[PDB]
Design an enzyme around this catalytic site. Sequence first.
Site, PDB file in Angstrom:
ATOM      1  N   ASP B   3      42.154  49.382   5.286  1.00  0.00           N
ATOM      2  CA  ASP B   3      43.255  49.882   4.505  1.00  0.00           C
ATOM      3  C   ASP B   3      44.670  50.226   5.104  1.00  0.00           C
ATOM      4  O   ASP B   3      45.101  51.257   4.982  1.00  0.00           O
ATOM      5  CB  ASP B   3      42.581  51.222   4.038  1.00  0.00           C
ATOM      6  CG  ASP B   3      43.299  51.719   2.976  1.00  0.00           C
ATOM      7  OD1 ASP B   3      44.487  51.256   2.407  1.00  0.00           O
ATOM      8  OD2 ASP B   3      42.938  52.580   2.092  1.00  0.00           O
ATOM      9  N   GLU B   4      45.010  49.014   5.880  1.00  0.00           N
ATOM     10  CA  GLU B   4      46.338  49.046   6.803  1.00  0.00           C
ATOM     11  C   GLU B   4      46.223  47.758   7.757  1.00  0.00           C
ATOM     12  O   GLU B   4      47.380  47.241   7.508  1.00  0.00           O
ATOM     13  CB  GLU B   4      46.035  50.546   7.561  1.00  0.00           C
ATOM     14  CG  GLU B   4      47.472  51.159   7.614  1.00  0.00           C
ATOM     15  CD  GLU B   4      48.057  51.495   6.247  1.00  0.00           C
ATOM     16  OE1 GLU B   4      47.138  52.623   5.585  1.00  0.00           O
ATOM     17  OE2 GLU B   4      48.936  51.110   5.725  1.00  0.00           O
ATOM     18  N   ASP B 194      49.649  54.618 -17.869  1.00  0.00           N
ATOM     19  CA  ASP B 194      49.043  53.890 -18.661  1.00  0.00           C
ATOM     20  C   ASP B 194      48.706  52.293 -18.502  1.00  0.00           C
ATOM     21  O   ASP B 194      49.760  51.774 -18.783  1.00  0.00           O
ATOM     22  CB  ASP B 194      49.612  54.159 -20.290  1.00  0.00           C
ATOM     23  CG  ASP B 194      48.882  53.670 -21.265  1.00  0.00           C
ATOM     24  OD1 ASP B 194      47.816  53.254 -21.120  1.00  0.00           O
ATOM     25  OD2 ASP B 194      49.600  53.669 -22.451  1.00  0.00           O
ATOM     26  N   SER B 290      51.690  47.564 -28.893  1.00  0.00           N
ATOM     27  CA  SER B 290      51.389  48.546 -27.683  1.00  0.00           C
ATOM     28  C   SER B 290      50.080  47.759 -27.098  1.00  0.00           C
ATOM     29  O   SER B 290      49.134  47.379 -27.361  1.00  0.00           O
ATOM     30  CB  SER B 290      50.905  49.600 -28.411  1.00  0.00           C
ATOM     31  OG  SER B 290      51.493  50.791 -28.332  1.00  0.00           O
TER      32      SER B 290
END
Lengths: 218, 341
Positions: B3-4, B194, B290
């Site tokens: 993660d790096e 969203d 939408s």
Amino acid sequence: YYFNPNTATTSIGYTTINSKNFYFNNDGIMQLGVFKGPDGFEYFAPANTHNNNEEGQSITYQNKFLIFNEDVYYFDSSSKAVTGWRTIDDHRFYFEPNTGIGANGYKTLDGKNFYFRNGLPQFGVFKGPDGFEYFAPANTHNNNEEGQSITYQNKFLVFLGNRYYFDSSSKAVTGWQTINGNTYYFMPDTAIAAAGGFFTIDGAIYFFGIDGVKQPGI
Amino acid sequence: GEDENRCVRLYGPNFILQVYSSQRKSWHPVCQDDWNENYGRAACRDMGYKNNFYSSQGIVDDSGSTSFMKLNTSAGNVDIYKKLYHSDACSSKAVVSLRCIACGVNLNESALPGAWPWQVSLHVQNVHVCGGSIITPEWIVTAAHCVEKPLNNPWHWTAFAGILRQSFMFYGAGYQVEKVISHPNYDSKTKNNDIALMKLQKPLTFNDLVKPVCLPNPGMMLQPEQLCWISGWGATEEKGKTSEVLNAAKVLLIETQRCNSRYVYDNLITPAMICAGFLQGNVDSCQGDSGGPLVTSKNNIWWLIGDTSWGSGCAKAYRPGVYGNVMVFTDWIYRQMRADG
């Protein structure tokens, strides 16, 4: 038009000509489409639709759907249009007993209320004889069927970004409302709760947060 | 250190490959020397694209920074990013540019066939409910409020691509969605974050009428008021429904400092949201648009800016529409594609 070679009378209704079935209306005009035969509904398709069939001749056509002038039908393995509830591809459709067309609009059935569009029950909120109702997916409340209307009282409904509110009778409220100290407004023609910007209601201006709650603004 | 110290990122409108340097806490490009197609494929696979590889080539360095993660050869059959190490400057004078997927090219009122090949229509119970946007052969971007709570099974949805007429989107002809992934942060009230991912059960076949839309790379420098386009099935006429035809409307971005003003939305808009209206009104999104794509053209490539969230009048401007910020979620999109692999 087809006239009987012996009696010269114009054919009406289901008629068999040279082992080929045709349908004639009350005026004797040959018709194209779906009509009730002795063994059920049959499709009198145009010419060359199947196996170089003649125009107006009944053709073998089942186990698939049929769109005809915006009407929807379905034929089973017997080439007969199906009516009533039928499970096609794990979905239930309802077709009018009288005409066999796909259902449309609010339709109470055996104490269970739906809102059909082309014969497939819809999900959401749709106006009925008494008003709007939360037509919900299957097993959403008390083993309700797919799309059956369900009891939904005194709590909000959120659906595709639409925020509905239902009263004690399981009908969506409309116009101004006050719930838990919060003042709302629900569009009369859709029951959708205005939300997210300035709205022009009753010839004025009202601002609602996207939760739908009104903003006073003095 | 996954993660790096193993994170790669394409950068800019030129697709400049970079690798994170934990020692200095920075993103660095990679020198072109010693590099071939195999390490390009490795860097693509790491980024969640699996087997999608388009092209890699050296491009004259333009960012101006003087540092490079130089590759090694004699390290052995080890991790690719076990090798990339620092260096003051290489002698090749070229940095790597790596495109993992061909995207952002379309054919040159209603929209004609093949003009928006990345548009899709989502069918919940045979009725158009939300749009979408192809990003790979088996991933479609849309909104979280489309797939929320009641409607969240992948068995409810179905997608149609390359078809322009709603009347021509038959039953049983769409693509079945085999998973629905909504952003964990999504808040049903504020609709913040969203965005949703909808993985199809079968890959999309790409042709003149179906094609991906590239994702926003870091460092794009969006001008204050771009010239975007908005597509989807809606109703230009208010009090309308799902339009029989797919339309397209030129829209102009709006600065978040203006869209959050008190004549527009008074702080309703969060950092993950974007406004795109049109002055004089007469054009904006609408219902059925939408979950649809907002895209622009910069440096000859169609980019995906966001997807539709909500509005307050929809062609009644001075209350324009809002879209989620695809650039901000792009890392989560990559992670979701990566884990599924």
